[PDB]
């Protein structure tokens, strides 16, 4: 039965008529907010005299 039975071609369309877009690009932005906390103090007591 030695014979060629089928084939596949590596053909493609040309988008001179822009039928296909492919992947899309868009711009994005994210924000991170980092407010600074206040921390507990350290004190040096004295004598008011």
């Amino acid at each position: 039965d030695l014979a060629v039975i089928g084939f596949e071609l590596d053909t493609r369309f040309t988008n001179t008529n822009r039928r296909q877009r492919g992947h899309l690009l868009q711009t994005r932005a994210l924000q991170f907010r980092h407010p600074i906390p206040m921390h507990a103090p350290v004190t040096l007591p004295m004598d008011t005299m």
Binding site: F32, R33, H34, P35, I36, P37, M38
Partner: protein, 50 residues
């Protein structure tokens, strides 16, 4: 503020308008009831906990 440790620490009625909350706060922990028992999630540093 009224239910904070500040009032129950020394005298119950210390709090006055001179005290304020620091705006720089975060959601420190989130407790979920998972199938009848509680699981503690540490979420303090997540970008959406601020």
């Amino acid at each position: 503020m009224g239910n904070s440790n500040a009032n129950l620490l020394i005298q119950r009625g210390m709090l006055e308008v001179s005290d304020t909350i620091d705006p720089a706060g975060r959601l420190k922990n989130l407790f979920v009831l998972l199938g009848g028992k509680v699981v503690k999630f540490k979420v303090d540093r997540l970008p959406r906990a601020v």
